[PDB]
């Protein structure tokens, strides 16, 4: 209906991040190698310090957002359902799982 | 999808769950009809 | 019991007969196991 | 599977018993009167 296998989901996420990235590129347009040693086969690839910092910031930011949204579902989740008796939080959470099982 | 496992016998943690998580068709046979009728009638006959 | 009620009707007033007949149908309980006793005699009653 | 007695065999049985209880000229036992002369004596034994 319904669930999605772990592949299709992976693809969808890939596309989503592609769009986000392309938006960084457009907004950046609006505001405006391979060396392998002979001694060892160790490969080295020249890097732009920019876009690496931007990458780290992107990952951290998205992690923050996910953590926060899940946290809001934490908050509402416990405050919404007051019907049945409960001894502790963990009980109420379990019985909401029983609401998911219906 | 596997449902949750809820037993009458044990709730070690203390999860409190609704009574309906804790909480026949076939009717009689015509043999009962026959038997009751036979005792009924033979009883009447004897008494008479 | 359908028979017991009658054969006790012969010997005894229908009040005691019906009483005895009903007394044998009772839930029987051993720990978890429980079942109504729908058929045979319970030999533990004082008047069994 | 229903009862095993069958209506016929039951009728035969009840007939047998009736024939006997007339052969003996038996009185159905009376239910205890509200006043019974021996009633106290019996009660004492049962409690004992």
UniProtKB/Swiss-Prot annotation, chain A:
Domain of life: Eukaryota
More details: Present with 1670 molecules/cell in log phase SD medium.
Protein name according to UniProt: Pre-mRNA-splicing factor SYF2
Subunit architecture: Belongs to the NTC complex (or PRP19-associated complex), composed of at least CEF1, CLF1, ISY1, NTC20, SNT309, SYF1, SYF2, and PRP19.
Organism encoding this protein: Saccharomyces cerevisiae (strain ATCC 204508 / S288c) (Baker's yeast)
Family: Belongs to the SYF2 family.
Complete-protein stretch covered: 92 to 211 of 215
Compartments in which it is found: Nucleus
Start-end of Polar residues biased regions: 20-32
Function: Involved in pre-mRNA splicing and cell cycle control. As a component of the NTC complex (or PRP19-associated complex), associates to the spliceosome to mediate conformational rearrangement or to stabilize the structure of the spliceosome after U4 snRNA dissociation, which leads to spliceosome maturation. The cell cycle arrest of SYF2 defective cells may be due to the inefficient splicing of TUB1.
TM stretches of this protein: none
Curated annotation (Swiss-Prot), chain B:
Cell location: Nucleus
Function: Involved in pre-mRNA splicing. Associated with the spliceosome throughout the splicing reactions, until after the second catalytic step.
Assembly information from the UniProt record: Belongs to the CWC complex (or CEF1-associated complex), a spliceosome sub-complex reminiscent of a late-stage spliceosome composed of the U2, U5 and U6 snRNAs and at least BUD13, BUD31, BRR2, CDC40, CEF1, CLF1, CUS1, CWC2, CWC15, CWC21, CWC22, CWC23, CWC24, CWC25, CWC27, ECM2, HSH155, IST3, ISY1, LEA1, MSL1, NTC20, PRP8, PRP9, PRP11, PRP19, PRP21, PRP22, PRP45, PRP46, SLU7, SMB1, SMD1, SMD2, SMD3, SMX2, SMX3, SNT309, SNU114, SPP2, SYF1, SYF2, RSE1 and YJU2. Interacts with CLF1, PRP22 and PRP46. Interacts with SPP382.
Note from the entry: Present with 1670 molecules/cell in log phase SD medium.
Protein family: Belongs to the SNW family.
Protein name, UniProt field: Pre-mRNA-processing protein 45
Species this protein is from: Saccharomyces cerevisiae (strain ATCC 204508 / S288c)
Full protein segment contained here: 164 to 217 of 379
UniProtKB/Swiss-Prot annotation, chain D:
Localization annotation: Nucleus
Coiled coil: none
Superkingdom of this protein's organism: Eukaryota
Protein role: Functions as a scaffold that mediates the ordered assembly of spliceosomal proteins and snRNAs. Required for association of BRR2 with the spliceosomal U5 snRNP, and the subsequent assembly of the U4/U6-U5 tri-snRNP complex. Functions as a scaffold that positions spliceosomal U2, U5 and U6 snRNAs at splice sites on pre-mRNA substrates, so that splicing can occur. Interacts with both the 5' and the 3' splice site, as well as the branch region. Has a role in branch site-3' splice site selection. Associates with the branch site-3' splice 3'-exon region. Also has a role in cell cycle.
Notes concerning its domains: The MPN (JAB/Mov34) domain has structural similarity with deubiquitinating enzymes, but lacks the residues that would bind the catalytic metal ion. Contains a region with structural similarity to reverse transcriptase, presenting the classical thumb, fingers and palm architecture, but lacks enzyme activity, since the essential metal-binding residues are not conserved.
Additional facts recorded: Present with 468 molecules/cell in log phase SD medium.
Record note on quaternary structure: Component of the U4/U6-U5 tri-snRNP complex composed of the U4, U6 and U5 snRNAs and at least PRP3, PRP4, PRP6, PRP8, PRP18, PRP31, PRP38, SNU13, SNU23, SNU66, SNU114, SPP381, SMB1, SMD1, SMD2, SMD3, SMX2, SMX3, LSM2, LSM3, LSM4, LSM5, LSM6, LSM7, LSM8, BRR2 and DIB1.
Name assigned to this protein: Pre-mRNA-splicing factor 8
Lineage summary: Eukaryota, Fungi, Dikarya, Ascomycota, Saccharomycotina
